[PDB]
């Protein structure tokens, strides 16, 4: 008559209940219905390709060997302690792109299982996983990161187990704030991707694909508008009189030295990634244009009327570089 007496006369002491024989044995595949509930979403490292995320992963399936009889009518949801949580069957999922998952054990175990009157079983657990989504930052200050998280069965083919989403809001998240990125709950489009392995079986899988988008404002008021100002200053270097140039030399060389210092200093705050990004293309094209202004002044000195072509040709190429650059990277 207490809450554990019905469990002890329902399984493991009563008529046989094998906790490793799945429900509907030698029959239809079990349909597990999962829906995660994200708490925190942080530490998206560009040098380890991980991102930590805490989920309230709950999964709800059908167990016909656990139909509650008419011994009590007030309790529709007969609970069970996490002590005997190993005593009844549960689907064996695992995250195929994780690194080190762990449960939470504050003030209690954070697992909770319900058994319903009509045979349904529900499991909620609080996981803190650290997944692995590859960050291909080739468009770094204006890039997107479409990267995902996939739950798969382990040892059960698709004719034994099958994961489906809840189909009404099956993935949620709080009002959170990433340091750099901006998690778009607009595009949260999930989906199945079953893993046909090489001959050995056909294992189920479901996944959620987040679409992170980095915000550009710090880089624009960082190493974009100061660099563009330095390049426009290097253009204004020519406007001093070319006869006996005492100001064209400093107005070129200190702009070039300032841009070289800006590049070699703000190579630090960027993610240490050894392939060519977008910001490096921009900074090196701007440094090359400063050096081209120095070259044009030098061929004016060693040979005049070439500055009249320079002031109308080289910014006319700076605008072409700018439109092709901010048209390919936007």
Ligand X SMILES: O=C1C[C@@H]2OCC=C3CN4CC[C@]56c7ccccc7N1[C@H]5[C@H]2[C@H]3C[C@H]46
Q: Is 112 in the site for ligand X (CB under 6 A)?
A: yes
CA dihedral 133, 169, 155, 54 (to 10 degrees): 50
Q: What is 66-111 written as a DSSP string? A: G---TT-SS-SEEEE-SGGGGSS----EEETTBS---B--SSS-SE
Cβ proximity to ligand X: between 33 and 44 the closer is 33
203 binds, among another protein, ligand NAG, ligand X, none (CB under 5 to 8 A by kind): ligand X
Among 19, 64, 155, 250, binds ligand X (CB under 6 A): 155
- From the list 64-72, 185-193, 272-280, 304-312, the region that binds another protein by CB under 8 A is 272-280
142 binds, among ligand NAG, ligand X, another protein, none (CB under 5 to 8 A by kind): none
* Long-range interactions of 229-237: CB distance < 8 A, separation 24+: 230/255, 230/258, 230/259, 230/262, 230/286, 230/290, 231/255, 231/259, 231/286, 231/289, 231/290, 231/318, 234/289, 234/290, 234/293, 235/293, 235/311, 235/314, 235/315, 235/318, 237/293, 237/297
| Segment 149 to 178, residues that bind another protein, using CB under 8 A | 154-155, 175-178
How far is the first Cα of the chain from the last one, in angstroms, to the nearest whole number?
68
Would you give the distance in Å from CA 252 to the centre of its chain?
Answer: 43
Q: Is 4 in the site for another protein (CB under 8 A)?
A: yes
CB of 259 to ligand X, least distance (A): 51
CB of 45 to ligand NAG, least distance (A): 30
- From the list 185-193, 196-204, 254-262, 289-297, the region that binds ligand X by CB under 6 A is 196-204
- The candidate with the shortest Cα–Cα distance to 294, out of 258, 248, 327, is 248
Q: Is 187 in the site for another protein (CB under 8 A)?
A: no
Can you tell me whether residue 38 is helix, strand or coil?
Answer: strand
Does an H or E element contain 273, and which? none
d(CA 119, CA 89): 13
| Segment 148 to 207, residues that bind ligand NAG, using CB under 6 A | 162, 164-165, 192, 194, 206
- From the list 195-203, 222-230, 263-271, 297-305, the region that binds ligand X by CB under 6 A is 195-203
Cβ proximity to ligand NAG: between 166 and 322 the closer is 166
- From the list 63-71, 204-212, 264-272, 317-325, the region that binds another protein by CB under 8 A is 264-272
Among 9, 71, 264, 308, binds another protein (CB under 8 A): 264
Contact residues for ligand NAG (CB under 6 A)? 162, 164-165, 192, 194, 206
Contact residues for ligand X (CB under 6 A)? 37, 56, 58, 112, 124, 154-155, 197, 200, 203
């Amino acid at each position: 008559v207490p809450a554990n007496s019905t469990s002890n006369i329902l399984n493991r002491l009563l008529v046989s209940y094998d906790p490793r024989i799945r429900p509907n044995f030698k029959g239809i595949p079990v349909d597990v219905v999962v829906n995660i509930f994200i708490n925190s979403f942080g530490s998206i490292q560009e040098t380890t390709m991980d991102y930590r995320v805490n989920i309230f992963l709950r999964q709800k399936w059908n167990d016909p060997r656990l139909k509650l009889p008419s011994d009590f009518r007030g309790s529709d949801a007969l609970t069970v302690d996490p002590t005997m949580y190993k005593c009844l069957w549960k689907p064996d999922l695992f995250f195929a792109n994780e690194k080190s998952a762990n449960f939470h054990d504050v003030t209690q175990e954070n697992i909770l299982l319900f058994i319903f009157r009509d045979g349904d079983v529900l499991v909620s657990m609080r996981l803190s996983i650290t997944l692995s989504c590859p960050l291909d930052l080739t468009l770094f200050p204006m890039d997107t990161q479409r990267c995902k998280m996939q739950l798969e069965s382990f040892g059960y083919t698709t004719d034994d187990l099958r994961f489906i989403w809840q189909s009404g809001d099956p993935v949620q998240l709080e009002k959170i704030a990433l340091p750099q990125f901006d998690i778009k709950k607009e595009d949260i489009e999930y989906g199945n991707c079953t893993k046909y392995y090489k001959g050995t079986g056909y294992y189920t899988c479901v996944e959620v694909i987040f679409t992170l988008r980095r915000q550009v404002g710090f880089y624009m008021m960082g190493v974009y508008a100061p660099t563009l100002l330095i390049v426009v200053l290097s253009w204004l270097s020519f406007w001093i009189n070319p006869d006996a140039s005492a100001a064209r030399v400093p107005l070129g060389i200190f702009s070039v030295l300032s841009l070289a210092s800006e590049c070699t200093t703000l190579a630090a705050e960027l993610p240490k990634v050894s392939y060519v990004k977008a910001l490096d293309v921009w900074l090196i094209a701007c440094l090359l244009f400063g050096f081209a202004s120095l070259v044009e002044y030098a061929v004016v000195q060693v040979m005049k009327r070439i500055d009249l072509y320079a002031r109308a040709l080289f910014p006319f190429c700076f605008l072409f570089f700018n439109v092709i650059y901010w048209s390919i990277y936007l």
